[PDB]
Each structure stands twice: as structure tokens, then as C-alpha cells.
Amino acid sequence: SFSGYLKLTDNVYIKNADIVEEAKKVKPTVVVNAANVYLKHGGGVAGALNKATNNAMQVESDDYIATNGPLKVGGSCVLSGHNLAKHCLHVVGPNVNKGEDIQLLKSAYENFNQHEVLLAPLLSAGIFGADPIHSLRVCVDTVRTNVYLAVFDKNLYDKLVSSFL
């Protein structure tokens, strides 16, 4: 099970960790991907998770998009977790760098409530351009299931913990 996490609330935990390394170690039931609507896993968390699957995530994702079309911003889909988890919950947080409504971050986090326990990154953080402090706040105030947050950057992790109300 999950080790070395700092407990923020009744159900939200946080750790300074590489989500790929964490997923390979824990083999959780669900790992969350910071997906885009096209499931094009090019960079950030998505690029890293996909590279860890030797591109099997991208191949599965392209078939999913060919069949279903793009996801909605704020939406999700469950696909295989490959060598990282039982499942991957691809969740699309708004990309501030694409001018997407930051208000959609709460809708994005609501997808986590369909899973009792998840390993996840902060949605819309990193290359998605949102303030990670705000993302953690929305996470805590939206997710009711058990979420283990992996924050890659130590400096950001320390800032998130030290500023957590």
C-alpha cells in the first residue's frame, strides 16, 4: 500500500514523488493521468506515464478516440493501467495555456469520486498552467474518496504543504 505520505485531510494524502515510480512501486488499482481531450500523451505527467508503458497507453488511447471521439474538458475515461496500475483514469483538467475555464477543475476532480482509492497528480498543474495551490484546494474540497497525490517537484511539494490551510 501507499507509504511516506503526509495526511492533509480525512481522505487526501500527499507525497513528493515521481508518479511513474510511485505507480510502479504501489501498482495501485487506479492511477490518474493528466490527460487532454485527444488523449495525446505528449508531455508532463501524460508523456511520462505513456513512456513508462512503452507507448501502449498511447496505442490504446488512439483506439479509444477513434471509437468514441474526444473527451470533454472536465471529463474522464477509464482505460488500462498497463504496467503501472490496474486502471488508468484519464482525467482532463482545464488547460489554462489553452484558455480553458479554470471553473472546470472542480468537474475534473469529481471524476475521482467514482473510485474508492486513487494515485493522482494535481490536476491542471504543471504544463496545464493552473496554480497548484489552487488545484490542491479544489482537490480537498471536491474529492471524497481516498486520493494519494504525487507531487514531482520538491520545492512545490514544500510550498503546498507549508501553505495548506
Ligand X SMILES: COc1ccc2[nH]cc(CN(C)C)c2c1
**What does the binding site for ligand X look like in residue numbers (CB under 6 A)?**
65-66, 68-69
**Which C-beta is closer to ligand X: that of 73 or that of 120?**
73
11: which residues sit within 8 A by CB, 6+ positions away? Answer: 143, 144, 145, 146, 147
**Which C-beta is closer to ligand X: that of 43 or that of 69?**
69
Amino acid at 11: N
**Which C-beta is closer to ligand X: that of 30 or that of 35?**
35
Q: How far is the CB of 82 from ligand X (least distance, A)?
A: 22
14: which residues sit within 8 A by CB, 6+ positions away? Answer: 5, 6, 8, 136, 148, 149, 151, 157, 160, 161
Q: How far is the CB of 63 from ligand X (least distance, A)?
A: 9
Q: How far is the CB of 120 from ligand X (least distance, A)?
A: 27
**Which C-beta is closer to ligand X: that of 66 or that of 165?**
66
- Which grid cell sits at 44? 508532463
Amino acid at 138: V
Q: How far is the CB of 69 from ligand X (least distance, A)?
A: 4
- Which grid cell sits at 53? 508503458
